[PDB]
Curated annotation (Swiss-Prot), chain A:
This is Small ribosomal subunit protein uS13. NCBIfam families: uS13_bact. Pfam families: Ribosomal_S13. It comes from the Bacteria.
From Swiss-Prot, chain C:
It comes from Escherichia coli (strain K12). Keywords: Ribonucleoprotein, Ribosomal protein, Ribosome biogenesis, RNA-binding, Transcription, Transcription antitermination, Transcription regulation. The lineage of its organism: Bacteria, Pseudomonadati, Pseudomonadota, Gammaproteobacteria, Enterobacterales. One of its GO terms (molecular function) is structural constituent of ribosome. Part of the 30S ribosomal subunit. Can also form a heterodimer with the transcription antitermination protein NusB. Binding of S10 to NusB is mutually exclusive with its incorporation into the ribosome. The rRNA transcription and antitermination complex (rrnTAC) consists of RNAP, NusA, NusB, NusE (this protein), NusG, SubB, ribosomal protein S4, DNA and precursor rRNA; S4 is more flexible than other subunits. PROSITE patterns: RIBOSOMAL_S10. This is Small ribosomal subunit protein uS10.
UniProtKB/Swiss-Prot annotation, chain E:
It comes from the Bacteria. This is Small ribosomal subunit protein uS9. The lineage of its organism: Bacteria, Pseudomonadati, Pseudomonadota, Gammaproteobacteria, Enterobacterales. Part of the 30S ribosomal subunit. Contacts 16S rRNA. Cross-links to the P site tRNA and weakly to the A site tRNA. GO terms for cellular component: cytoplasm; cytosol; cytosolic small ribosomal subunit. The C-terminal tail plays a role in the affinity of the 30S P site for different tRNAs. Mutations that decrease this affinity are suppressed in the 70S ribosome. Belongs to the universal ribosomal protein uS9 family. Keywords: Ribonucleoprotein, Ribosomal protein, RNA-binding, tRNA-binding. GO terms for biological process: cytoplasmic translation.
Curated annotation (Swiss-Prot), chain F:
It comes from Escherichia coli (strain K12). This is Small ribosomal subunit protein uS19. GO terms for molecular function: rRNA binding; structural constituent of ribosome; tRNA binding. Part of the 30S ribosomal subunit. Binds S13 and L5 and cross-links to the A site tRNA. It comes from the Bacteria.
Amino acid sequence: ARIAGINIPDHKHAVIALTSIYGVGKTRSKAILAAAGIAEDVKISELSEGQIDTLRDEVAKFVVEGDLRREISMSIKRLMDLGCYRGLRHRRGLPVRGQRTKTNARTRKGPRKP
Amino acid sequence: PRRRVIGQRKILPDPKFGSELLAKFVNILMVDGKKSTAESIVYSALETLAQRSGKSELEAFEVALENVRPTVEVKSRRVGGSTYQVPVEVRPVRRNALAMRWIVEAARKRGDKSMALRLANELSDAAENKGTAVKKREDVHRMAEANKAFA
Amino acid sequence: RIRIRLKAFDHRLIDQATAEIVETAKRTGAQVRGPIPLPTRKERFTVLISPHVNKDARDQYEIRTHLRLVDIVEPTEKTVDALMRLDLAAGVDVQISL
Amino acid sequence: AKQSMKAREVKRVALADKYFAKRAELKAIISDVNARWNAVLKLQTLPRDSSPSRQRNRCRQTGRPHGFLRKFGLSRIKVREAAMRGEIPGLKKASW
Amino acid sequence: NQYYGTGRRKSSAARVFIKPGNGKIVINQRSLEQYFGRETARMVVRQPLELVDMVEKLDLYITVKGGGISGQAGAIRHGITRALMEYDESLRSELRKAGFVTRDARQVERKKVGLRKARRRPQFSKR
Amino acid sequence: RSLKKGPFIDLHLLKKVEKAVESGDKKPLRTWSRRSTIFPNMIGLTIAVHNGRQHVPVFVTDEMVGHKLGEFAPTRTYR
Amino acid sequence: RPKTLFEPGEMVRVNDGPFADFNGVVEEVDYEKSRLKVSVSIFGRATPVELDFSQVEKA
RNA sequence: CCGGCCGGGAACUCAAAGGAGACUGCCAGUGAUAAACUGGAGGAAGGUGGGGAUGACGUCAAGUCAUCAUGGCCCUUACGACCAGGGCUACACACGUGCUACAAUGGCGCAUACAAAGAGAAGCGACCUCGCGAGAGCAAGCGGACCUCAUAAAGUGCGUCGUAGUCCGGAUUGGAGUCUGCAACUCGACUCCAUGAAGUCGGAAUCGCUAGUAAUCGUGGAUCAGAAUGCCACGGUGAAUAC
C-alpha cells in the first residue's frame, strides 16, 4: 500500500525495501525496523498488516518524500536569491566543494564539446 | 631465448591428488596469487562433476582434457603476409598446455553464475564434444588444414 | 647491576671499546658477564639527486648506529674505581643504568 | 640569497616566543572551551604575522624553504654537498 | 636425548626439537591439523618424513614465528631436514634427491628508485 | 567549517560593530578583512567586503545564517 | 648518606657507579621514582648515569 | 598467579662482532696437447650462487644565472624593503602520469591464524570514563629488542544476496559536527544523516614483466601548525611462458 513510499517495495528484502524509498538509507532502515520488532534478515513477502501499521507510524516522524525534495530546492533557491558563492556556483552549474574545473568535474558541469 | 633455449620452471605434484597436471591446472586458473581460493573451486567443480556424471575422479578431467587435446599446432612460416599457420605434430608438453589454456579461457568466457558451475559445465560439455574449448580446438585444426601449403 | 650501554657509529670501534671494558674488570677481580648484542639501528635517508628537474632519480644514504650492553653482575670495590677513564673512546656514547 | 625571507623568518623566531608559546595555551583552554563567556575576545589580540603557523621551515645556510630536512637542519643538496665530501658523520651510501 | 633443527623460509623462524615418542606434531603449543593441516600447505611438512616412513617413531615440538602459512610450514620443512641427523646419514643421501635438504635461495628482491616495486617500470607514452 | 564554540568575529571589526550600536546605520565602510561570521547581532550592517581589486557593498540579512564575509566577495573572474 | 633532598643543576659525587672519586652535575631529576640522571664530562662527552638518592651525597 | 612469571639453562628462536666455505676445484668426455665447455659426485649454493652500490675517453653550446658563487648589463625616495587581502586551485578545451570500478572469483555481517621494515620529547599517547561515531577530558612508560604508533590485511569457516545497472561501484548536492591553527573566507582533512550520475572489462593504438618476477593485500618514513591515490622503504600469498 501507500506506506509513505514512492512505490510498492515488494519482492525484496526488508532492509532493501526501506532503502528503495527517497529519504531513507541503510541506517534509517535498521533504525525503523529495530524500533518496531521487524525481522531484518527476511523478505516482506506475506507480511502482516499489524507490523506494517507500526512502520507507517514510524516513517512519518522524519521528513517524507517530495517535502524533502522541496526542502533541498528551497535551501538551494534561498542561496540563489541571496547571491552568495553557493548560489552563484549552483546557478552556473559548477562544483562548490573545491573540485577542480580544469579537467574533471564533468558530472556537475556536463558532457564534453570542444 | 636468443642465446640458449630455456624451459619454464618445473613444478611438483599437487598436495591433494598427487598429479603434476592438476598442479599446472590450478596454477593457470589462479588469480591475484590466491592459490587456496583457486584450488578450492577446482576441487569443488571436480567433486560435483564426478558425483553428477557418475564417472571416476581420474576420468572426470582426463577424458575432458582428452577431447580438447590437439594433435597439430600452427607454425608461422610467413607465406600469407608475414604470418601463416603451417600444421605440424604438437609436442606433449605443448599438447597438454594448449588444452589447459583453452579449457581455462572457456571457463572464464562461460556465462554461468559461479566459477564452479562455469568449470563443471565446460568440463561436462567438453567430454561430449560440445563445449567452447571443443569449438576452439575444432577451428584451429580446420584453419591449419586449409593453410597446409607445406608439412 | 652496572648496566653499561654503548652507542657508536662503527662496528670496529664499539667491540674494541667494550674489550677494555671487559678486561679492566675481569682481571682486577669481580663478576662480569659477556657483551649482549643489542640490535643495531639502521636509519635510511632518501633524497632527490638532481637540483632543477628530477622525476624518478634519487640518491640513498644510511647510518648504522651500533649498540652494546656489558651489564656487570656484581659492583665490587675493585671495578668501581678502575673501569672507566682509560679507553679514550671519544666516539662512543656510554650510558649506565643501575 | 634573497635577504627578505631570511629577515622575516629570523624576526618570526624571536616574536613567536615573545608573544606565543605562553598565551597560546590560554587560547586553547578558553576559546576551545574546556571545563559562550566573554573572555575569548581578549585572547585573539595576538600578532597575525608572528603566528607559528606562518613560520615556514628553511635551510640554515641559504634559507631555502623547499627540500629542507629537520634532522640535519639543511636542504637535500646541502646534505648531499656535505655527505659527498665526508663532513656528515657515518652518512655512508645505502647499498643493501 | 634431543635432535634439533632451525630452518627458515624468507620471513619465518622455527626451533624443531625432535624427541622420541608418538607420531604426533606439536606446533606453537597446538595440534597440526588445527592450525593449517586441513587447508593450504597440508602435506609439505610430511614430504621429508614420507621417504623414511617414521609414522609413529618421533614426536616433534616446534615453535615457529614470522611470515604466513606457507612461510611457517617452509621453516618447519627446513627445520625437519636440518634435524634429520638423529640417526646415521644413509637416509639424508636419498632426501637430497627430493630437493628439501637444499635451502631455497628464492627470496624477495628489494624495491628500486623510479620503480613501483622490484622490476615494474612506469608506463611509457605512445608518441 | 566555522569555529566550534562560537562565531569568530575579527577584533577591529568587533570594535566597528560596537561603534555601530551608538552611531547606527552609516555609509559603506571599506575594510580589508573577510574573516568574520554573521549572527543576529550583525544584521543591518552596510560594510564593504574586500575582494582584491574592489570592495563589494554587502547588506546583511537573515538568509546569511552561517556564511562568512568571504562568501560574498568576488575574487576571481569569469570569461 | 646525608643531604637526601636534591635539586636540578646541582653538583654531586659518584660513589657506587663506575665514576668514583669524581664529581658531576644532575641534568634531570625524577622525584617520583627517586632516580638521578647525572652526567660525567669524561673524554669531552656527556655520560648519562643513573644514581639513587640515598647512595650519594650533595656536594 | 597457569602469565616466561621464577630458580636454572644459557642450549636455542632472535640478535652482532670475528672466521671458515665456491677457487674451473674433483673426476670423466669434448676441444688444440692451450684457454674453455657439457654431465656427474661433494656441498646449503657450481662456472661472475641471487640482488644492490660503483656508469670509461666522450656526446647533446642538454637542464639549473631560481640552492649558492660569479663576469657583463640594469634599478637605487625603487626592478630594493614591510604589511593586509587576492592569485599560484579559474573553464567552450586538448595531453601525460596515477587511483576506483564494471562482480558471485565478489558485496554485507560475525568469529579467527601468521609479519617484516621504521619512527617517536611542544612527541608516540596506552588504561579508564563520555559521545553510535569522528574526538574531548583525566592520565603510565620510554629519546628506544622494554613504552607507543599497531588490531597486519588478503586467507579461512558459516548465514545472506543469483546476473539485474543489483546489498556491484561510488560521482555530485544539501543539513548538522569534530581536529589543527589569529583565523577554514574564495581554496583543507575527517565523522553523522539523506541523494545513488556515468560505468555491462572499453575504437585506432600502446605499455610492464623471464621466478620469489608479474599480479594482489597491508605496514612505516621524509616533507608536514594542520593537510597525499604522489615519492621512498618493508613483508603476506604467489604465477603464467619460452618451439
